[PDB]
């Protein structure tokens, strides 16, 4: 999950759907930096 | 009525007739039972139906202040007697209604921060831990800790520049002699080395622990801007003011915190930190600390209305206490997350909540029932500690009559209190005078 | 009466309760009824023929039950209500409607005071239409008089004429033109239209108090016992929510007591008063005769 | 002995936009106090005299 | 925010609208002329052929009102301001160009 507040996750808007996708491709970039150091 | 009584018997029975604990009851003495800072308040309208006759009587309780001084060298008994007041003062303070909705606030907080989906930056963690439930919790543990004088303890992460900017609002409103000093200094040092010393370009302070001065007391001497040295002087000299009102000594706030004029002295300080260039810092550090200082500076209308609301719900609930409130650092500190302070300053708007009078007469009736029980278990034990010395009972030990005094007070436990704290508590119960209804029944 | 489905549907349009910030939106118009207008016409007369104290029950949030409390004080005399409920109504009228209108400070009032709040703001206010209505409501009581043997508390000549409501209309119309200089514009515009629901009902409110003071006057003729006035212990609770249901539900249909009704309220009062004096004369004549015969 | 509610109720009903069920008896007897002070038309005044 | 001064402290129920109180604070010339026109924008009541009907001004009819507004938006798009970040400046300056 994202652990943002529950009225943003289950909401169906346009300004609140993009906020979940931007916080989802910050995790995949922060896990991409931590994985490259470990190799 | 006639009798047949022994002259020893008549001396006892005459004493029960003259010394009765009843006093006449009227309409002007029911309204004088309400405290003076409520029946003079212009927000509450007081009305009654029946008028009592000339016959009716009532028994007055004895609310006289603490004669044992349990806040003086009794440091484990005072911690139970001030945790008990903190849970009671938390279920009385009202909860906020008609808040700004959470979804319409993070959508506005995400467009002011301008957060990008590819670079990892420090403006993502400004969004953590805000919701409608933790905004309702910071409001309670600020009012309920002040009425019970529980020591607070800040909890935060130093990689979050929004719990540090909204942490400049706690220290300018809540007095600094209330947070525990191992956590007040570790938060003032995070504000100094991040927000304000990089904003003017000087070298960040190398602070060793154990110094006699907090880092806000040592930085107003070093800094040379004017409008950020007026705020940094109000934080240092913020104290409660001990005044005795209506018999009980209670600690009032400042005269600027009640007005909300402190925030207008704060929003000139951090309106100037966002105007300076950051000379030794890179450009992405000037921008990521000027956006977090802007989410607080658009709430200048809503933060003057928030300081006026904490300072009013603390004034009305302070009139409903009867026991003397003392200012002593307690053992166990009640935690306060600094993320829920951020969740309060940018979620409240345009809805005054004041405590209902059906919970002011219930918070008052518990504070009289505990105080009139604590003061009538002293007199039940002083009049036997003294009566077992006038009668010369040299073989008796007085543990079993202090053990029934801690037990009949309902809030204490006996399996925790050792024997050292009981034969020393009766060193204080011996010097007190016997109440005058128990002295003539012993003579 | 006026039809209760046409008044509330019009009264909910002038107040505009949905657009405000009000917790009790569907609770302003609960007590308007056809069975509760007949109650405050019977409670107001029968607690005035038998000198019975009468407390007030109201909600200080609901300002429409407070404007109809201005008509209750200007007609019913001030010594009828219990003092703690007359002060608590006179304070809520000043501290919400009158003093926010003229821009004065909120009235700090202490409960141990000989002066009622309508006697303090009768001097500190600087209008003339409002300071002259506050002078009538301070100085209306029962004027004791002895008619045909018995004492009876009688109203003054200005209420039985119905002329006082022509002064209350002038004290309520000028209070509707006042700019409330700190009140929000949404809440000010709804307290100015709740006032004009009573200032525009002038012709059928003078016509009420000419009847409310005539049913009391023609029923007071058949009172054989003495009409003494003291403060009782228990009070008959009058609800200011249902006084609103009387001032704006009355019509042009006058009712007078029937002569068979008026001769039955007389014959109950003579049969009880002559029985009260035929037991005193029988309880004295035994208590005295037991003492002459030396009966310990 | 006549009461003038029934001819102001017919005056609103003869216009088309107003409805009768939302107008109480306050707003219908207050309206005839403005209909008395008006002068009657010269065709109706000469046929009443 | 376009001139860098502190945002106004407005409470409800005040007798002055915020455009009647910002023409006293702003000492620019081309944008204090536009606030003076907005505050004095009223209907003019004339009677014509017996019928009282309300006329607009002679500048709203001409269209010369917009030549006072677009002289105030053009100067407000050029003012740089220090208390706000750079991207908040660039987003107001883009929406003012669509007009």
Coordinates of C-alpha atoms in Angstrom, one line a residue, chain C residues 66 74 134 162 201 207 226:
Chain C
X66 CA -36.9 34.4 21.0
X74 CA -44.9 43.1 26.7
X134 CA -38.2 48.7 27.3
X162 CA -54.3 46.5 22.5
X201 CA -48.4 40.8 11.4
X207 CA -56.5 41.8 17.5
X226 CA -59.6 36.3 47.0

